[model samples]
Target: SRRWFHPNITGVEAENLLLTRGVDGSFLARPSGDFTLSVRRNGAVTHIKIQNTGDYYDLYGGEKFATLAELVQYYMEHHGQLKEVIELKYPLNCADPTSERWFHGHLSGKEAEKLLTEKGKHGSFLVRESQSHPGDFVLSVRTGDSKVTHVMIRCQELKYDVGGGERFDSLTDLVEHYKKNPMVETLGTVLQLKQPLNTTRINAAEIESRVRELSGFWEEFETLQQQECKLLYSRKEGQRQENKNKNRYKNILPFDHTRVVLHDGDPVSDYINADIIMPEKSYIATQGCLQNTVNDFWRMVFQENSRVIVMTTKEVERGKSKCVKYWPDEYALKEYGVMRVRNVKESAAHDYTLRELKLSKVGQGNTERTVWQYHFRTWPDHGVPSDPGGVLDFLEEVHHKQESIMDAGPVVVHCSAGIGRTGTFIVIDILIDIIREKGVDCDIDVPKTIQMVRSQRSGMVQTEAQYRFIYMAVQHYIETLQRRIEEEQ
Candidate 1:
């Protein structure tokens, strides 16, 4: 954007002028006749092309540049603030076509004072200069109101016809022109990519790819969540059991039957113990600590006639403890690994099974690691935005695998801590199913259901953020359903 300045013209004879700021804090001048302004920021040249709207040689020229410290001095001198350097670069003589090249620098006390004084006296001002080039000099002089002001300072020992210059109508017009250039956005993106991520610098490609991959996972997660809703709401005759004596139903059974078992560390063992008594097609669900959990799943597979399925909150890479445990018990844990319905279709075995669901990560040797993919909603390491959609999709895909392969099998979902994210996920599914089956919008009832689940499961879900996420997930589901209905028409 260009800021314009029209200094009072005062003198019997006008002097020719050309000024510029070098990369260092030094002033330079180019011989002039129809000179152009070029701007740069952080060492990159700004490629903003300007066209003349007035007679050539109508524009005045000026230049300035200074280090950040010097610029701070300028600002303090003018604004009367000892503030730390927050912003650098002020504009001067910016109306000309190549204003970016000639006049730009950190505004110091002196520069700010001059700028305020000039603007106050002149009623209008524009900064002209290049951010790419800065130096240590400022040109400001008072002139008479009537004298025709023209001054040319030549530094490069070159000269041309002073009659050839350009003019712009207004500062707003100049800024509008700058905004039309895409170069500014490109430079901004480059700068953003240069910022450190997790103490490690990342290239633009890495940032872009990571975003794309996460976005893709989110897309799939939404679908899987929707599918799960459909399944949960599917008909089951006489399933509801009410407590006539008590105020509420004892076995309303919004979710399948499973006695809550609280364990400090070995939740898998609890699930295994429960699965021993259940039917062969039943599911046992527990969250956290994959090695101990999956090992117990396998032990249960060896003990019971039923299949054991466990959902791990974290990713398990090949050769890792989690992977080594689950892969060897692949036959026993096949059902648990049903990450997608398609995966279930591929594994047609009906025997007792133990399986686990995990986000895949390629380990070692330049193999792109996707450990971050495990927690789609939040990064495990840094706690930044994780792909909410991705986590939902993975869950959905795993559920689909379960539905397609195992005939009428129970599903289990778990995560670390066994209570927070795991409880949130299950509650979300239950709420969606209840809403869909009742054909009612009773989202407020979710909290009640959550309370019931927690009472039975021993504070299975924790954290207010995770609780809020459940509500948001429900809202998202409702919005999506509305959108789908509209699209179908």
Candidate 2:
């Protein structure tokens, strides 16, 4: 094959290259720092200029040039020839249009309105001069509330630059490019002007107001379900076949549900009921595994690359089978489908049991992985913990264990339906983290946080009791922290 090379540089790339070569300030024999090449905007036209170097003599052709473009073109064509004499000044003016050297003649308010009315269609077009890049005017095309693309019209060459490096000869050419390529193409250097936008600040009063409003919160919840009913049951076969009423929640796998890729790269459902909490701060909230979904559950653990599992519901609770015994009790191997799980070690506590499970896949290079399962036995079914202390201590241990791991995945948390105790534990943990970081001044929005969790998986913090438990847990944590501070003082 013959070697080939192509150079398709965008205006941003070209500008970056020019900046790298120190092309923007005073040239040799021009000590006033006036011979700076800058781009400017003059209402629908881009003006390229060499500021303060009026009628400068071009060294290559010995011809006098009025504009900066001619001088820049000479240097660009001759590359390394003018390396010795040029000395660029600090903080190049070309980068920012607000510099005094660049001139931008903006449209009047009425003129801008008229232009918008004339050019814009279906609320698509928006015209504004760039605050950062002076001579460049931004024509934003939006489809409804979402932005479609931004077309930057440079005044000098009358060239149009879209997102990426695609530059067109004219506005017609740019429109034609979009027509030909109907699919959305990523544009180059799209300016994000509205960064650091303010968020609604929640104060202590707001928190108390929300808690008070929670008395009639069920009505609001019912209204939300009625308004956006389809959102609750998005997954068709998300619920288990056998344990429908006991284990099923309306929403399941709220985000990107994990799919297991077999040895031959074919994907199959792991049958693991889980939902993401926060992206990296994710908790795999799931129902306790049944006998049928046991193998699939292990497959999920392997696929999600999960290291820690917090089992809130005991294997059997209140004369009812709560969760399946997923891991072996002693140093024995239990095979579930292709996965073989071995109990490496087990340690007993007053309220929980910690197990170290070594899992391996059969007939697939025997890839091995270790799992830590924290089984809490004290939690009563359909009820809150007796006190927050035990659960909080256990959660702290889980956090410590998670932090000890190098590249741990999301912590798998499950009760019977992965909603009641599961949701309560997650909320308390997240609140603790937030409070520790933000201190007592932190505006803890319990209702909003619960709603966020519910948006991910339906029926999170299942009962009003569990919902109220979150407030109790957080309050206890705050009180404990204050007590500790006072004792230390």
Candidate 3:
């Protein structure tokens, strides 16, 4: 038989008992403060009064318990949910006297640095000012080739982001909380201080400077085209002869580890070019499907699991063949190699035509996949749209459709040669994603991003005009976002 409480249990003892029973520290009012417990002899019950709140809760069910031992036993069985609710309603504050005095008191800058250094041995650490709130700091930790994880620490508030929309009072408090809970294995790292990169908002001057920088690259572009043969994955003799210009290099798409192979195990190269832009294999920039390689084009689409094909060139332009009519008209099916493709729906917009295509392999149980084809008729070969807005609008539509698809494949975009208009479209799309992720004013390394694409596939953003067009496209995108923001305000 367990003895009944004499209504004189100390707060420390109550807290210790709660901790032993797996109650979170956040649920307690103040670990060191006084606590009041009441016992009813008539019903043989124990009721503990919650601090700060005038509510009393029985350790057990509404039914009275015979002794304190019975109350503790009942609480042990059913306390997790109740404790969580209490923690939510009355969150612990780091600045609170009882909390700050315990594990996480204010420390000198040197002491803080030493503590973080000891913890960040294996990983790199970066500290930057909070973008949303000035005077605050964000501590970012990058561990073992993973994306950076951040913890926003507000010095004034003595609070730090601690998951679940909750904040702990201090860095020490935040670290200790994770130590006990240990949900993620991101711990164990020594802090090496690294200066944060400048992510300042983009200004008109910076954009203008970028425009000038890209213009200067035109000289280099001319040189690159002349030295095409020296480049890796350069255009071969047959591929160059197939192109309108004998000097033009045939574009090639690079795959990860394994090259995309045809049905006969021959590596698919030339005729079409592709490279990933951000998010591994996110977008594939290719040349317009030619008559000879049309079948290979469909094979590439099916094999790579591409969900969208953005055609920036018309089938016939200036009485010349640009891209072959690879997809069939609605209500008709066309066969290319072992693949059968049909346009299930066609909807024309002001700037682009949208086609819903159903693709199936002729054999092997007729494996099928649905794809969207966006054909922009207004963009001329080797030229840009007269107005950037039209292209921006078309790109937005493509992005929305791509986003709607759950785990959708990379978007395959193409123009006639796959480097001029194709490069422009891909650059604009990549810039849009960068702007959306980092605010419109965030710095964009236009030349670097384009160089990355070119490195993977030769001759991206082919000419000076095309490179300049990319700058214009980004400017227009930023202005559009600004307009939307003003309208909302």
Candidate 4:
């Protein structure tokens, strides 16, 4: 999609982008000796050379790919390939997360105090970068009787905390907790957060359409959900006594007839909670890998000849194990049933990691094929990515990896339940392919896609919010493509 491709930006510009608005592991590609992967790490920017000889792209003696995109994607998926342990995690995608208007990136304590005093209501506050400590934050609030107080929160090893209180993952979360808990001053004053003094202001009527569309989207989802009875599908295998522990949740199971069957194993042991949902079995939808079912998972991947695995949920989300560790650690070989898989290369991205795994049958005599896992870590179990553009960008990278592989089988897609974000990604990817072939003007149906997949599996595209996100992702991808077509030399 060239979303990570900044053609005109200089090396300095790339560095600025990574440092100013980027987090550690955030990166972008800019043309230099062909191109350079500039990444943000430890508050500093690192520029690594990428050589594109027109024949192939590589980092000197490392692995090769057909295009700069592929080369970067490969390294990002296997950051361990680099000597510096360099990770191309988050591609400075959309200039991106939890967006709060009150979060002024950089501000002096005095300036913050004046702003709160000038524009804030009583107990109104704002968050800003600490001038004394570059990585820390300052919370400025208009406390009791027009007094301004700035409490600096230290950012230790990326986790934010006020003194020795609870360490929050993000400023938004930390502020959210403090708002309810109430911060006490050194003396006797109680620092209570009443409201966040936002930077952007809008008249209430301006948001009327947004609210209307939001409500309509929810209604549309609810409307389609009522039609779940138009077709009936059996999930008998998933509910069977033998396959009880194979599923993450009892309710979310694959339709018995369409579920993937592992042929090599015992007929009864072949029951995995996965469905080959896409036409031609090009995509298999399954739940997150469970500890007991980890071996069964690799067998499914091997049996189906799946080369690209799109894992949507992180291993742990908010203290819950969405998926257990199914794959082995770096350079470690893991065997599940008759299959043996090794982590050939593992690289981190801002939101995801693409791991190159060598998959082979135990007795198959060095006939292993390469499989890539697109592990998306940032998408929380309860919500989707804040930047749908980022999600689109990630899928494009995944598509590139999958399409380039010759004779690659189905792309195995999964999330916490395999039905929510898993279904969400598959639908978006399928539509993008169609839009690419048919043009943006080509008409398509969203409800039909959701319904079609749900018939094959239970709870695919399970939520109204996710149902709404499919449209946003497709529209965003189309807009991106449309703009690219219009770009003049």
Candidate 5:
């Protein structure tokens, strides 16, 4: 949570901050006759008199809030229910506490316990700030059915600790250490931090700071450029005599360990130019369609149970053929080996064309499944997109469609050689996964994340610009989430 109250700044200073630093619907509270609330609306700052008569924090005359923060929070939530200046939307913060995805904003003591009792498992936990002693933190966890536990985390001289046990520099490190080593309660249970609470949770306060940290993209990209690609892994599979021509590029090949082998009932003759990217959630990265490898590409998708195919290659670039479309023409059907594919519908969305195709096993009834090919076409002819929002939304709908289907398998993503843009997309998605897990404020090391997936497909995230684009994409994602959090609040 953020402190929105300003104790010293006058009404005139408040007007400058709201007009210059904030946007329409942005507001801040400052000192007036009793207290003044300055709001930005319709290109002007309007000062509303908040009569702080000691007991009730009165705003629109009758209805009141006990605390000043509560007074501001209630009006913003009501959404123009108050006639004064069409309601307050955003609160210009005084300062913010160091927080994370585990931080439930403004949740009361009983509210926290009831939440843990309702949805949390025995070891599921959450850490929230103390209301009484502002800045003090509390670790709440569930130990049994309807049994919730609380441990006060005292912050002394900026160091956090449970009691006199072990001291840590921050709440993040404290939670990390206690997870590995269990903490025993006074007379009873051993509290195990098995998992943190899951939500589409984003902290409204640090949302802006998270996006503002696009500061480190260049440093992170340069750092990635410095790390030597240590190729201790062998490429024996792609180097096989007959499979040599199957590869898109001479040097780009999957490691023998992670490469996907075709499963067409033959042991010795099952080779495909694809590698299953072992990035937490399964993703298969393969090159664009080739004349001879088209049949094997379909084989890989079916074998992996993949329902989404992300095609990142433009149709053509540098007057050379980058990729050949694997699907048939509109409303037409085609077959590549044992898999039957029918292109049912196609719609273009400026940046990409989504082709809905029905796939089935050859001559096997009841094997029909829907597969969506998201071909991202509007990639700048010269370099990456100037902004990341274009690709971010494309990827969102791609995952949105993929996750919509029940029991759907790994998503298949491809580029000309499956390393450049394909790897870029995967890195962004992987980072987004952990962001939603811990939060925007959670430690996100971009190059290190790219390097992990690089282990699966050696030359992934190929270019420096593509690496920078990954950071930009994550920045836009956080901004998009901030608006969502704003609306929900």
Candidate 6:
């Protein structure tokens, strides 16, 4: 493939062929670093032919030309007839036509002489007699533009010569060939990294893999959620049995009379006041951090309206180092309000002196309806859960009691540090709503919807995982819905 072939014609024959093409026609040559033009009807165009040399024709158009003179002959035969070709003159030093370089065009006889004189100061000008046309002259100019930013120039001039130095037939052919070159293709890839031209939606598999990769941060968060889940569930069980017979006042349903007040802030000292008020017979169902927040709000509900069934994950007793373990065990959550344990492994809460309605812990409501609240231990920093099964399980729970939850209108949800897990979980829920209500093929305006949510909450999903999770979750939901539709058929 890399073999060299001896040309059938000699350099003199090639030069003579070029000189013959220009008989009675204007010709320019930059020989000996000076400019010359000859008006002849027939002379070889070898010099101009050599201007565009490379393997451009072979890999590009596979044009047939054994020598530069042949290529130039073809070019002159085709282009010389054009009216525009008659006005052509050779370019000079500072000849580059780009913003970075000065472009001097159409030099007069006197100017060409002056250019030659200036060039002679640097070195002796070499001039050769034309093989076919006498009085033919070549005019040359200094190239400018050190930074090669313009690509509109002929490709043969831009690229390094291939193994065999050959001339391309034309600029068009050269450009086409350059595009197919492996080196040029690599350059295009690099250009994309520096300046991306467009953005395309990612595939579902890519999104999932990305989320899973960021699951480490979530694991630490899971520890927090697991502890919290256990605490809340245990508290709920305890409240159910404790208030089994104490139906004192007008029994407002669990979610009906009560409200979750969510105030946004740092969980350490800032209060998360949801201020979520439920209708007559409904409960809140939330995913991820919102579940965590909803539960914390429930603890606050226990403080305000002690009559409510308050359940949550972890607990912190006021003024004590002991963590009120709420998982699997029912503890009479006391008068002291719940507090986040901060950088610690445990949380605490106090015992209530009275079964009052105003001091009930959050996540608790009057109605028998279960207000589901659970966090993905690994939400927030990571964005989405590693396990789609886990997310689906949560969705299943919500679906089982969909009527109760949806009938209650928008359910209150929040994480101690909401937004990350909260945004991802909520987006998934919205996607589910679209699937169920508008069919699995529903077309939700993703960009508009994300912008709307972002307006409501700054950095709604705080992590890349969260963003990707929402996308994947939507995909999963749609696929599952489609499968179900097929199964029914």
Number of the top candidate by lDDT?
A: 5
Candidate 2 structure quality by residue, lDDT tens digits, 318-423? 6977688888868899898878898999999998999999888866665787889998988865457657788888888988888888778788898876766787
lDDT per residue as tens, model 1, 275-349 = 111211233434333443444443333333222244443344223221223432222323333111111111322
Report the Cα lDDT for candidate 6: 0.32
By TM-score, who's the top model here? Answer: 5
lDDT of each: 0.31, 0.55, 0.55, 0.72, 0.73, 0.32
Q: By TM-score, how accurate is candidate 3?
A: 0.51
Q: Name the better of 2 and 4 by TM-score.
A: 4
Model 4: per-residue lDDT, tens digit, 63-162?
5432344455556767677655677788665311113445666567777877787778778988888786777788887876668887878988768888
| Worst lDDT 10-window in candidate 2 | 1-10
For model 3 the local lDDT of residue 175 reads 46
lDDT per residue (tens digit) for residues 91-200 in model 6 = 11111111110112234445544544443322122211122333232222222211111122222443322233444543223323543542232234211111111112
Per-residue lDDT, model 4, residue 158, is: 63
Show the colliding residue pairs in model 5: none
* RMSD each, Å: 26.5, 25.7, 27.4, 19.2, 20.3, 30.3
Regions of candidate 3 where Cα sits further than 4 Å from its true position: 1-259, 263-281, 364-366
Question: What's model 4's overall lDDT?
Answer: 0.72
Candidate 4 residue-wise lDDT at 317: 78
RMSD of 3: 27.4
Better of 3 and 6 by lDDT: 3
Which portions of model 1 miss their true places by more than 4 Å? 1-283, 289-293, 301-312, 315-324, 329-387, 405-407, 439-444
Backbone collisions counted per model: 62, 8, 9, 8, 0, 100
